[PDB]
Symmetry: none
Subunit: 217 residues, 10 copies
C-alpha cells in the first residue's frame, strides 16, 4: 500500500532548498533524510517537481534518465541484479524504472504493486546521484588563497569544500588538498608545515598540527 510523504516535511524541505541552496551540506542531509525509505517513481518525481525550480527540474530529469540508463546497462551486464530476475521474463525495462510501463502511468498504487524492492532502491540511488550532479552543476579550487587576516580553519573549510565539490576523481582529492595546504596558506603557515619533524600524510593530520603550533594572534 502506498503512503504519500507529508506535505509538511516537503514544505520544510522546499524552504530549506530555497534559503540554503542546492549544494549546502544541510540540504543534502535533509534530502538523504527524505530519501530514507525506498520511494516509488511517482514520489521522487513529485518531490523534485515541488522542491526544485523549473530549470533545475529539467536538468534533474535529464540526469536521472542518464543514471537509470547506466543502471540498466549494468543490469543487462549482470542477470543477478536485485531488480532483475533469473529468467529473461523479469528483465527490467526503462519504462518500468521511470514509471512509464503498463499499469503504472499516473497510478502510484499500481506502481507500488508491480515494482520490486530492488527496483525501488535502484531508482532511489539513481535519483540521489542525479540530484548531486544537478546541484554541482547549478552553482575554482586552484584559485583559493588564505587571506592575510583569515584564520586557518576557515581557509581549510573553504578549500576542502571547493575541492570535494569539484570535477576531480575521488582518489585525487586528498593529495590535492595537502599540496594546496602546502603552497597556499600564507608563508608563515607554509614554513610551519615545511618544518614538520613528522611526515604529515593526511589533511586531518596537517590541520591538527597547524592548530597545535599556530601563532596565537
Amino acid at each position: 500500500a502506498w503512503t504519500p510523504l507529508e506535505p509538511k516535511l516537503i514544505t520544510r524541505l522546499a524552504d530549506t532548498v530555497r534559503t540554503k541552496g542546492l549544494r549546502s551540506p544541510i540540504t543534502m542531509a535533509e534530502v538523504e533524510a527524505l530519501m530514507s525509505s525506498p520511494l516509488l517513481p511517482h514520489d521522487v518525481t513529485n518531490l523534485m517537481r515541488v522542491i526544485l525550480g523549473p530549470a533545475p527540474y529539467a536538468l534533474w530529469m535529464d540526469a536521472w534518465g542518464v543514471q537509470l540508463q547506466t543502471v540498466i546497462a549494468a543490469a543487462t551486464r549482470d542477470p543477478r541484479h536485485p531488480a532483475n530476475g533469473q529468467g529473461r521474463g523479469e528483465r527490467t525495462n526503462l519504462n518500468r524504472l521511470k514509471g512509464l510501463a503498463d499499469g503504472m502511468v499516473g497510478n502510484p498504487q499500481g506502481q507500488a504493486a508491480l515494482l520490486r524492492p530492488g527496483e525501488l532502491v535502484a531508482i532511489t540511488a539513481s535519483a540521489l546521484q542525479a540530484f548531486r550532479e544537478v546541484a554541482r552543476l547549478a552553482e575554482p579550487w586552484a584559485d583559493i588563497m588564505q587571506g592575510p587576516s583569515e584564520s586557518f580553519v576557515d581557509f581549510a573549510n573553504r578549500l576542502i569544500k571547493a575541492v570535494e565539490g569539484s570535477d576531480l576523481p575521488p582518489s585525487a582529492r586528498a593529495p590535492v588538498i595537502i599540496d594546496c595546504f602546502r603552497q597556499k596558506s600564507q608563508p608563515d603557515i607554509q614554513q610551519l608545515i615545511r618544518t614538520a619533524p613528522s611526515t604529515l600524510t593526511t589533511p586531518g593530520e596537517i590541520i591538527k598540527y597547524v592548530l597545535d603550533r599556530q601563532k596565537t594572534a
Copy 2:
C-alpha cells in the same frame, strides 16, 4: 505573457530561465509545444552575449536542460 519575457541587462541566466519556464508551462500552449517554444525563446531572448554563446555551440542542443547546462558552463563570470 511568455512572448514578452526578456532577460534584463543585470539579471542572471538561471532567474531568466526560471521565469520563462514558469510562464511557458503555466500558459495555454499544448503540452507538446512547450519545449520548442522554450528553446526558441532561449535563442532569441537572453541578451546578445548569451545569444551568441548559444549560436556558436559546436554541439546541437535539443532540450532546455541541455541549453541551460551549456550556458551555465561557458557563461561569462561577472
Copy 3:
C-alpha cells in the same frame, strides 16, 4: 529495524553548533541528548557530516578512527568485550565498527541487522570522545 533521526532535531542541533560553537556546555549537552540511543555508524557519520564543517569533519574522522583503534586494542586484550564473542569467530574488526564490513557499506538496514548492541554502544562512546577531542582542538 532502523529509524532515522529527525531532520528537525538535526537542524536545530546544527544551528546550535553554528551559533554557540563546538565547546559550549549547552552544545555538549545537546550532543549527549542526540547521543542517547545507540546509533549505527551510518547515523553518527551522517550526523557529523551535517553538524560539522568540512575541516572539523576531517578532524573528527581522524579522531574517531584513533579511538576505535584503541577500543579494538582493548578488545583483543580482553575476549569478554560486549562487542566480542566467546569464540574467535566473533572477533570484531574495524571494518565492522566503521561500517565498512561486508553487507554494511552504504546500507543502514543491513548494518542494524548484523551489528551487536555492545558494538553500537562502543561506537557511540568512541564517537562522543572523538567529538570532545575535536571540539577541544578546533578552538
Copy 4:
C-alpha cells in the same frame, strides 16, 4: 659468463648525469638504455657508485633496499614468482637479491652462476624504481602561473613537468593539469578555454584548442 659494461658508456652516462642532472628525460632515457639487459647486483651497484655522488648513492642504496623488500613481500605472498621456485627450497632471500648470499659476495662470476633470470629482472626493475625515487627526491605545481610575457607552450611544459614529477597518484594528474590550465593561464586564455563550444576532457585537447585559437602576438 659475466661481461662488464663498457667504461666508455659508463663515462658518457656519468657526464650526462653531471651536466643534465638526475631528473632530465634524456638522463632517464640513457639509464633505461644502460638498464636494457638484466644486470647482476654487482653491475648495478658499481654503476650507481660511479654515476651518482656519495649522498645520492646513499639515498639510492636505501631506496633500492626498500623496493627489494617490497618485492620479497610480494614473493612470499605468491609462490609463483619468476624469482621463486615451486618448493620451499627455492625461496629467494634478500641476501641473494642484494648479492650478499653465500658464494656471491664480491664475486660477479659466481653471482651470474647462481642467480635466476627472474631474479635479475626483478633486481633491475627495483633498481630502476629506486633511481626514479632518488632523482625525484634530490631535486610546487600549485604555485605555477603563466607569466604576462610567457607563451602558452612553455607554461604547459612547465606545468606538466611539475605535476608529473610530484607526489600525486598517477590517476590524479590529468584532472589537476586540466583544472590548472583553467584557473592559471592568465585571463585571456582563461576566457578562451571557458568559451569552448566543445567540452575539452584531456590536456592534449586543451593545448590543441588553445594553440589553434590563440591571439597571435
Copy 5:
C-alpha cells in the same frame, strides 16, 4: 589583384568579403584553388580584430560562407 586587397580601417566586413571574392573569382586561379585562397585571405587580411575573431573560433571553419556567417554573428557592433 587579389593579393593586394586589405580591409580598410572604416570598411565593413561584407563589403570587404564582396570585393575579395570578386577579385579572386575574376582572376587567373584554377577553380579548385579559389576557396582555400579566399579563406586564407580572410584570415590574414581583415584587420586584426576580425583576425583574432576568426582565430579564436571554437569550431573549425572550412568554407568562406561559414566564415562569413560566424563573423557576422560575433562581430563588434559599431
Copy 6:
C-alpha cells in the same frame, strides 16, 4: 631479438630537435632516418618521450592514438591487412598496436615476440604521421 637504439643517436636527435625545432626539413629527415627499421611500440614511445617535451609528447600520444584508430578502421574494412590474418582470430586490437595487450605491457622482448612485421610497419607509419601533425601544430 630486440635491440635498442643507440643513446648516442638519440641524444644527437634530441639536440637537433632542441636547436632546429620540430618542423625543419633537417629534423624530419633525421626522424625518417631513425624511423628506418620497423620499431616496436616500446621503441617509438621511449623515443618520443626523450626527444619531445612534455606538452608535445601529450599531443603526440593523442595524434598517434587517432592515427592508429584510423588504421584499425581500415583493418576492419579489409581482412587482407598485413597486420591482420585470414581468420578472425588474427584480428589486431588497439591493445596489440599500442603495446597494451597481454604479454607486452612493459616488456619489449615479449613485444618483439608476438608482433607481426606488418603490425610494426603500420605502427611506424602511424607514429610518423602523428609526429608530422604535432610538428605542424606546435609551431
Copy 7:
C-alpha cells in the same frame, strides 16, 4: 533536349533582385516563377551565379550543399525515393545531384540525358529552400 532560360527573363529577375532585394515577396514570387519547370544543376547554378552577388552566391552554394545532403540522407533512409531506383545500382550520389558525376561536368546536354525527373525536382526544391535560407540570412 536541354533548352536554356531566356536571358531576358534572367536580366529582369536580376534587376528585380537588385532593386527589391532578396527577401521581398515579389522577388520570391519571381523566383518561384522561374523555378517552375524542373531545372538541371547547370541551369540553377548559372541562374544563381547571375542573379546573386559573390558573397550571397557563396552562401547559397553552402546552403544548397547542406540541403542536398539532407535529401541524400532521406534517400538512403528510404529506397523509394523518386530519385532512387529499386536496386542498389540506381542509388543517387551527391556527384550526380550537384552535376559533378561522370559525363555531366560542364555539359548540360549529357546532364539532361542521365538525370531523372525525380532528381530534377529534388534538386529544384533543394535550391529553392537554400535560396530562402540565404535570403533570410543576408538581411
Copy 8:
C-alpha cells in the same frame, strides 16, 4: 682532512654533504666508523640553521641518507 670541513655561509647543503662524504670515505677511518662520523659531522658542522633543523627532528635520524632527505625537505628555500 674530514675534521676541518665546514659548510660555508653561502654553500648549499648537497655540496657540503658531497664534500664531507667524499673526504670521510676517502680517509684512513675503518669502514665501520664512517656513518657515525658523517652523522656527527652533519650535526656539529653545517651552520647553525641546519644544526637547529637537525636538532629539532621529531624523528630519530640514524643514517646519513635519512638526514640528507630530512634536511632537503625542510630546508629554508633561499
Copy 9:
C-alpha cells in the same frame, strides 16, 4: 607568588625558569600539581617570542626539563 611571575624584557630564560620553579615548588600547591603549573606558566608567561617558540614545537613537550632544553636549543642568540 608564582602566578605573578613574568619574564622581564631583558631577563634571560634560565633565570626566569629558576625563579618560576623556585616559587612554584616553595608554595602551597600539592606535589602532583607542580609540573603542569610550571609548564602552563612557561607557555603563558615567557614573553611572546618564547611563547611562539614553544607554541610551534613540532614535538609535544610534556616536562619542564624538555621545554627548557628545547628553548635553550632554539633560542634567539642575543
Copy 10:
C-alpha cells in the same frame, strides 16, 4: 639499616658545585666520591635536590627517568639482571627503581629493606650518567 650522608660533606659538595660548576673534573670526582656506596633512591634524590638548582634538578629528574627506562628495557631483555630474579615475580618495575613502589614512598628505612643491591647499583649508575648528561647540557 639506612644511614644518611653527612650534611657537612653535602654542604662542601654543594659549595664545590656552586664555585667550580657542574662540568669541572674536580666536581665530577667529588660526585664520584659521594657516589661510592650504593645509595637508595631517597639519598640520590635528596642529594640532587640540595646540590643542584631548580632547573638543573628538573633536567636531572628527566634524564634519570630516561636512563632508568633504558635499564628496565635491558632488564626485560635479560632475565639475569642483578636487579631481577629468576621467576617472573621478581621483575623490577620503575616504581621500585624510582622509589615509588608500595612500602617505599617517603620512607627510606622500608626502601632499604625491600631493595636489592643490584637495584641499588643500577639506580646509582643511572643517576651518575644522568648527572653527566645534565652537566654537559647546562653549560
